[PDB]
Amino acid sequence: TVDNYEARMPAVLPFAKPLASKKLNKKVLKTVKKASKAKNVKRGVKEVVKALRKGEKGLVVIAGDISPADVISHIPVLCEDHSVPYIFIPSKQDLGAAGATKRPTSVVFIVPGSNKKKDGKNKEEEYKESFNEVVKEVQAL
Amino acid sequence: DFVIKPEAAGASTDTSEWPLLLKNFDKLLVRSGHYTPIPAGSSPLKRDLKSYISSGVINLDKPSNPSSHEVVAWIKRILRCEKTGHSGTLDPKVTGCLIVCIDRATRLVKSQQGAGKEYVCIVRLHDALKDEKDLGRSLENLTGATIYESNLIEFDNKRNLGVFWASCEAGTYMRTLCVHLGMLLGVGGHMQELRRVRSGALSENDNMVTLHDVMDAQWVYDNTRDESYLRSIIQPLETLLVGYKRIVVKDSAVNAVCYGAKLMIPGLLRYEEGIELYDEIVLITTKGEAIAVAIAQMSTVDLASCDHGVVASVKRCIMERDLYPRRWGLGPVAQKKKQMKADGKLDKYGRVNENTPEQWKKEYVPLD
Amino acid sequence: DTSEWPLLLKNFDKLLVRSGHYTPIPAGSSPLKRDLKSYISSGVINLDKPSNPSSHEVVAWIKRILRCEKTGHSGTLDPKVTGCLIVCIDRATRLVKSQQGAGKEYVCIVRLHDALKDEKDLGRSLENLTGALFQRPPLISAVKRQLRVRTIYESNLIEFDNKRNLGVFWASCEAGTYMRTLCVHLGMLLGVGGHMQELRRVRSGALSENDNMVTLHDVMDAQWVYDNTRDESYLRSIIQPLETLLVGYKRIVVKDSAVNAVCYGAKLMIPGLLRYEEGIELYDEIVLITTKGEAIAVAIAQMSTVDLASCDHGVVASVKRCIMERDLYPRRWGLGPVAQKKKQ
Amino acid sequence: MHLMYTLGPDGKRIYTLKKVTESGEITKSAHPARFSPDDKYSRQRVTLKKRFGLVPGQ
Amino acid sequence: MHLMYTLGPDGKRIYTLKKVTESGEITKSAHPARFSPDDKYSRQRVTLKKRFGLVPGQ
Amino acid sequence: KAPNPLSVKKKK
Amino acid sequence: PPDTVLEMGAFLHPCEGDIVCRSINTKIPYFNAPIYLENKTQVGKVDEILGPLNEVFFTIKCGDGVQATSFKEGDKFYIAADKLLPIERFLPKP
RNA sequence: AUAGUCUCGUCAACGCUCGAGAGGCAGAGUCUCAAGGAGCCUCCGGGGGCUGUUGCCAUGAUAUAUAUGGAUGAGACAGAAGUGGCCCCGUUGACGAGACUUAGAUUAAGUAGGCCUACCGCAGUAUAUUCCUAAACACUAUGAAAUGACCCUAGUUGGUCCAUGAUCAUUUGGGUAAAACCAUACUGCAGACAUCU
């Protein structure tokens, strides 16, 4: 089938900057999937906003094909307030699939170290290098 | 050389692009072109921000959690005004169009009641249909005599979902309509979603904004001192009066009409074709401001034909009382009546007595 | 076809026509077709002011070079600013503040006292300083130092060198805004400290640096050319008419017979109105022009569009400030049909 | 939700149940976003829309 | 002085801190030359600019 | 402290 | 010292020997107004008022023996009640 | 006197989704729910499919629960708490209360006094002058430049300025310190509805 990267580009909101490249989008989706296996993830606007307000640190991934736009139009400047890097991807179905849920989600906040279990700590250690290189490539934009 | 030559090309006055109540101003028949403008008042689009908000309406997209009264109270809290209101009430689960009137615009709430409403509704059918088109036929069984008109937009039998547009008074009749569609189809059906696409004069395509827009515009004005966004989201109350027939008033008679006088022939400036006796009309100035909603006490041929009479009576006064100066009593017949009252040819109230000369009994007709 | 027409006569066919017919009077001229004395006495120079002199010294220099009777400016007195300086000569001084609502634009270099840990923060700090702002005038400025609110409408960070510690940014600001205070505030929000290294005004009111900007060498060379050669072309090239300062104003075209009465202080009436803008509102500031495009006065509108279109008589405008001289046009009042009928 | 819409040539809404139309244009949700009167993010929304010229009247 | 400029496609100035742009174009100083009211070289400047047509009046 | 005498002048 | 002092600012960072504070007070301070603690002891006076209307900052001119590096984030700085003036004054009148 | 308008609080009548709660919405705290797991089959420890229209949670709503939905959320604590956080029908008539008026809509160059003055419109002038002197800013005259000059607890190779004149010394001499508007006084020009064919 057609990939959701090329499919959802007409639906991308005008303020969806920075937008990930296809290789970067694949790396972000893989990192989100590994973090969801680590359970080091916040899904949806409510959880992401609450975690940002408490002071959690990580990476924010925002879907681009969001209608209406007032669902997510406060997230990027709120991430800038708390010094958290963010990046936009064009598809919310892919974000939900990588975020270990059946239905699509709007925004994902990877917070490393958010799981109390030791198995979650080991999974954090194994996806840590991918998370670090993704964050460096996002901040390089 | 570059000099504007005589009879050169230039823009001609096209009143079709004039805003709001000033649109098609050339269609109005002219009672008189001789008048003195008073440098008072403003255009409805050019009011200062206090008068613009105090005379403003908001076409709003209501969310699916709250009711209309709660949204109106929220808008009053956000804009920090004295009064807010609305005419068409939406149920909580319904989204769509809602007209919110602010302060002086709340005077027009009662008048716009009873206007037509248009909804777009999704009906969920409990079972699949043997024939799809029968649903449309079923809709034609329910349309008319109360649903005035309806149109089936789409119907997916695999999803068992049908979206259709209809015109009706309320949304509880939409629940009832979906239940009767289910019963006459025989499979049974209920309402999935409902949305009002038109409430009264305004629709969803006529500058609908959201509650986030209202909050952001108030925030921008408070913290940035920028009024453009607040002026964009808020429309004048004259937008609600475009359907009415218009009568244009001289500036000397505006304040007298605002206090409660009956508007008369010397005050009339322009009038519209098709004005019939006892029809509801709108009294406007030359700047397009709405003075009042009135009742036409004379017809169009009468307005063309008579030299004296009562033109209209104020049903609901819209304009503030002291926006225009008091210029009544300064006319020729008015000063003559004052002189007769002072000099004993009329009593203290102005009625005819024995000292009144017979020529005043002939030429003057008391409209009181 | 009217887009190439100069100055205030540009796009004059968009004006609504009240009266299409008039009989011209062979008096006056176009602003570009004036004689050289009237051209200089009504002239405006968009000057590329250098860094070292102040604006007062530059205005005095232009007055001494061109042998004017007075010259003026309404620019901010920050030292070391280069770029746009609007110099009004003689009568044009009365229009020295006609474009204050247009604002100004600046390209500014900020020097940071230390290197930032994060580069992008500088841009973020600039985005924090956009909007209504609390500013106090610096010590160097002649304006009294009280706290005011000044609006920066839009700003953009052009470049930043963290090793050189220098940041070039463009800003659009309200008149009365100081960029020295803005650079100090940027340094205060960053925490490293900073100040204004260089400042350049790229737009002042309506005129910009691309709108025929000349240097002081151009003024002195043009005066030398006219003195020794009797050639006006270079002096006419560097000097602009005052009508350039009146763009963006709503225009009313006045009949020739009604011009000089307006110069004598009369209100403008409906029989003297010829053409007018769409959307003229009551109490707006407007410019009264002739058919030749020369400006009679700045006036205050007494009627709106419907009254301008459909009223047979009455006050159209009241003179706020008269630019044109008396008796440039003949006195033609008292000759109209209604006035002669009442006199008879 | 199920109500989707597109914009016609005139600019008015065309209502569909489809996520992707026959022409291939992705449809938009008709219902507005959830609002709370105690919302505290007007600054963030205004800043983001002002970075891209999306503020009405800008 | 640090402020340099180059000419864009539209003719407006692009301001920069660099001597040479990334495309390789040499940037020009944005500030004007220093002026003295006692300068006595108008004849030389006018003659040289008339020799090459650089006079604005010409 | 005080206005100039030429600034505030009485009528003739 | 005044009997009643109101919390004026919160510490942000030092800047060139001055203390930058985000204003936690709705009103604008007087120029050179003294800045206190909860102990009513003066640490300095207001040096500069800056920032947008929604987010006002002020820098304090530190006195003798008062160092900007000695204070940490979250420290509150207090002003007298009469040294505040309403923000409506600086806005243009209607 | 009469009549109208605006702001209000009661009764009656007629309609409606039939209207005050164990209610709803917004917000705060705690907890639960997102196929994040398990098995199988392939491909090169990881990737892709199958179980899986499965499972987990909510929902009886005019209702198919073999159903409809699920973070652009739902449920429990909570029939609670709180409301000094908000919301809970419309039209007409009558009564009572407070106000504003009681209005015929003027003026093709003004207002007030005794033919003339004063105010009003516009345009100008003045708002200290001369001499000496202090200071600031910039220039200019003379001499000094590539081993150029200045600053910093000072350099694994610091930074800034610099013939487009830096930084030093003598004073060589002149320049700038405005303009616009308000207020007061004075002077002058007009009282103009704009024909021209």
Swiss-Prot record, chain A:
Pfam (any one): Ribosomal_L7Ae
Gene3D superfamilies tied to this protein: 3.30.1330.30
Main location: nucleus
PROSITE patterns: RIBOSOMAL_L7AE
Record-stated family: Belongs to the eukaryotic ribosomal protein eL8 family.
Gene: NHP2
Biological processes annotated in GO: box H/ACA snoRNP assembly; rRNA processing; rRNA pseudouridine synthesis; snoRNA guided rRNA pseudouridine synthesis; snRNA pseudouridine synthesis
Alphabetized GO MF terms: box H/ACA snoRNA binding
Keyword RNA-binding in record: yes
Species, as recorded: Saccharomyces cerevisiae (strain ATCC 204508 / S288c) (Baker's yeast)
Keyword Ribonucleoprotein applies: yes
Alphabetized UniProt keyword annotations: Nucleus, Ribonucleoprotein, Ribosome biogenesis, RNA-binding, rRNA processing
Origin superkingdom: Eukaryota
GO CC annotations on file: box H/ACA snoRNP complex; nucleolus; sno(s)RNA-containing ribonucleoprotein complex
Quaternary data: Component of the small nucleolar ribonucleoprotein particles containing H/ACA-type snoRNAs (H/ACA snoRNPs). The protein component of the H/ACA snoRNP contains CBF5, GAR1, NHP2 and NOP10. The complex contains a stable core composed of CBF5 and NOP10, to which GAR1 and NHP2 subsequently bind. Interacts with SHQ1. Interacts with NAF1.
Compartments where found: Nucleus, Nucleolus
Alphabetized InterPro entries for the sequence: eL8/uL1-like, H/ACA_rnp_Nhp2-like, Ribosomal_eL30-like_sf, Ribosomal_eL8-like_CS, Ribosomal_eL8/eL30/eS12/Gad45, Ribosomal_eL8/Nhp2
Name listed for the protein in its UniProt record: H/ACA ribonucleoprotein complex subunit NHP2
UniProtKB/Swiss-Prot annotation, chain B:
GO CC annotation, single: box H/ACA snoRNP complex
Outcome reported for the amino acid change (mutating residue 90 to A): Reduced pseudouridylation of rRNA
Alphabetically ordered keywords of this record: Cell cycle, Cell division, Centromere, Chromosome, Cytoplasm, Cytoskeleton, DNA-binding, Isomerase, Isopeptide bond, Microtubule, Mitosis, Nucleus, Phosphoprotein, Repeat, Ribonucleoprotein, Ribosome biogenesis, RNA-binding, rRNA processing, Ubl conjugation
GO biological process: box H/ACA sno(s)RNA 3'-end processing; cell division; mRNA pseudouridine synthesis; rRNA modification; rRNA processing; rRNA pseudouridine synthesis; snoRNA guided rRNA pseudouridine synthesis; snRNA pseudouridine synthesis
Annotated positions of the Phosphothreonine modification: 356
UniProt-listed Enzyme Commission number(s): 5.4.99.-
Top EC category: isomerase
Catalytic residues (positions): 91
Disulfide bridges in this chain: none
Compositional bias per record (Basic and acidic residues), positions renumbered to this chain: 340-351
Function: Catalytic subunit of H/ACA small nucleolar ribonucleoprotein (H/ACA snoRNP) complex, which catalyzes pseudouridylation of rRNA. This involves the isomerization of uridine such that the ribose is subsequently attached to C5, instead of the normal N1. Pseudouridine ('psi') residues may serve to stabilize the conformation of rRNAs and play a central role in ribosomal RNA processing. The H/ACA snoRNP complex also mediates pseudouridylation of other types of RNAs. Catalyzes pseudouridylation at position 93 in U2 snRNA.
Similarity field: Belongs to the pseudouridine synthase TruB family.
Other notes: Present with 33600 molecules/cell in log phase SD medium.
Protein known as: H/ACA ribonucleoprotein complex subunit CBF5
Gene responsible for this protein: CBF5
Swiss-Prot record, chains D, E:
Main localisation: nucleus
Linked residues for Glycyl lysine isopeptide (Lys-Gly) (interchain with G-Cter in ubiquitin): 28
Gene Ontology BP annotations: rRNA processing; rRNA pseudouridine synthesis; snoRNA guided rRNA pseudouridine synthesis; snRNA pseudouridine synthesis
This protein's UniProt keywords: Isopeptide bond, Nucleus, Phosphoprotein, Ribonucleoprotein, Ribosome biogenesis, rRNA processing, Ubl conjugation
Subunit structure: Component of the small nucleolar ribonucleoprotein particles containing H/ACA-type snoRNAs (H/ACA snoRNPs). The protein component of the H/ACA snoRNP contains CBF5, GAR1, NHP2 and NOP10. The complex contains a stable core composed of CBF5 and NOP10, to which GAR1 and NHP2 subsequently bind.
Similarity field: Belongs to the NOP10 family.
Protein name: H/ACA ribonucleoprotein complex subunit NOP10
Swiss-Prot record, chain F:
Compartments where located: Mitochondrion; Nucleus, Nucleolus
Coiled coil segments of this chain: none
Family: Belongs to the UTP23/FCF1 family. UTP23 subfamily.
Other known facts: Present with 6960 molecules/cell in log phase SD medium.
Function noted in UniProt: Involved in rRNA-processing and ribosome biogenesis.
The protein, known as: rRNA-processing protein UTP23
Lineage, uppermost ranks: Eukaryota, Fungi, Dikarya, Ascomycota, Saccharomycotina
Parent-protein residues present: 200 to 211 of 254
